[PDB]
């Protein structure tokens, strides 16, 4: 835990869930009968984990919850968010009544269950689903993502004019719907300038439409977009593995690794966010919000002259190394560096077994290769086998084919 090495502390919030049989007794009662009221939310999480059909059968009672008072939409939102990772086709006659839902939130959520359910729709069904679509913008984009994913071409006549939405994140996902489902990704164009757009959120949005588009011409547009590695990867793993079948063709193998490798100083980067070489400079850059002034920071870190860089890290790593943010670029310039001084950072940064400092392990199985650790083959081995994200899984392959 990088709490024990670093002044920053991170603060978990650990709550003690119900077991199933106690989950099936609450999820349902009046929350005014409840000994312990919040006992009311976390039974859906706990149903959500469970495998038995009696607890689906109570799942989609709790998600057809009469949303009259104040506990039971709560509950109803947790319940069919529930009813996602269950991925149970039952789940679908209630996910589609909470498409009529007032809580617009339940909406959003009924749209992703449908997603994950991935089951077969009727036409009737995709009628339904196409109601929820011209709510508000942000459902419509999450209508529309459904239709992409679920792969739905009864509906382009209602997704094709939305390529020309005024805003951006309606139109891009309507656009990769059309190359994606209707196999017309000249659409995409606009989405390339919009990978470095001055707005944050059409950035990131660019970067996801681009992955459900499964257009693989954009991959090498991925590989430098200043948005964080995570997005970036799963996008491009889309373009070059559909199926996850935890192969990328070598003939893509070159833009994966520098993807993967992830260099700030290759990322397409404005002057806006590219900070001054000083240490409080850096540190506020790293600091920031948003993953593209954060890689002016790292990037100029890296322009630092050695010597004064090495304490620049030290110091930065003792403050901040538990913020999951800053660990990742820490690891990256180490590992790009290959700042072999700095070791230490790589072995713990691949030892890190807290799902938060994933795109860490990247970067520290990336610098075992560049700093020739090969005492670390067992540790990427096991993760070339077991590691639960994929472009993870598939970095430490590419480091043991080569270290």
Request: glycine content about 4%; charged content about 25%; some cysteine.
């Amino acid at each position: 835990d990088p709490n024990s090495s670093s002044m920053a502390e991170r603060f978990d919030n650990l709550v003690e869930g119900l077991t199933e049989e106690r989950a099936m007794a609450v999820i349902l009662a009046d929350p005014d009968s409840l000994e312990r009221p919040v006992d009311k939310y976390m039974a859906a999480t706990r149903l959500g984990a469970s495998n038995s059909e009696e607890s689906l059968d109570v799942l989609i009672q709790a998600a057809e919850l009469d949303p009259e008072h104040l506990f039971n939409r709560i509950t109803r939102r947790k319940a069919i968010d529930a009813l996602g990772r269950r991925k149970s086709p039952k789940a679908l006659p209630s996910l589609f009544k909470a498409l009529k839902c007032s809580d617009e939130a339940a909406v959003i959520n009924s749209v992703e269950a449908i997603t994950k359910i991935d089951a077969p729709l009727t036409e009737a069904d995709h009628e339904k689903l196409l109601e929820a679509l011209k709510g508000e913008d942000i459902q419509k984009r999450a209508v529309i993502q459904a239709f992409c994913r679920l792969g739905v071409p009864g509906v382009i006549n209602s997704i094709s004019p939305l390529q020309d939405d005024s805003n951006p994140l309606v139109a891009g996902a309507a656009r990769a719907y059309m190359s994606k489902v209707a196999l017309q990704p000249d659409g995409l164009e606009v989405l390339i300038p919009q990978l470095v757009d001055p707005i944050a959120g059409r950035r990131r949005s660019a970067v996801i439409d681009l992955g459900d588009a499964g257009d693989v011409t954009r991959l090498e547009a991925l590989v430098t977009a200043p948005v964080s590695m995570s997005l970036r990867a799963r996008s491009a793993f889309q373009l070059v593995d559909p199926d996850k079948t935890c192969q990328v063709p070598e003939k893509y193998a070159e833009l994966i690794t520098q993807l993967l490798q992830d260099n700030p100083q290759q990322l397409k980067l404005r002057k806006e966010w590219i900070c001054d070489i000083e240490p409080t400079e850096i540190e506020n850059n790293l600091q920031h919000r948003d993953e593209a002034r954060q890689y002016g920071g790292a990037s100029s870190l890296m322009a630092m002259p050695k010597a004064e860089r090495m304490i620049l890290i030290n110091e930065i790593k003792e403050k901040l190394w538990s913020d999951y943010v800053t660990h990742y670029y820490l690891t990256a310039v180490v590992g790009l560096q290959g700042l072999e001084e700095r070791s230490d950072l790589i072995r713990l940064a691949l030892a890190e077994t807290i799902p938060q400092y994933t795109k860490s392990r990247i970067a520290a199985a990336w610098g075992c290769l560049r700093l020739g650790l090969v005492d670390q083959k067992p540790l990427l081995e096991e993760l070339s086998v077991s590691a639960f994200w994929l472009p993870l899984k598939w970095t430490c392959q590419r480091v043991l084919k080569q270290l």
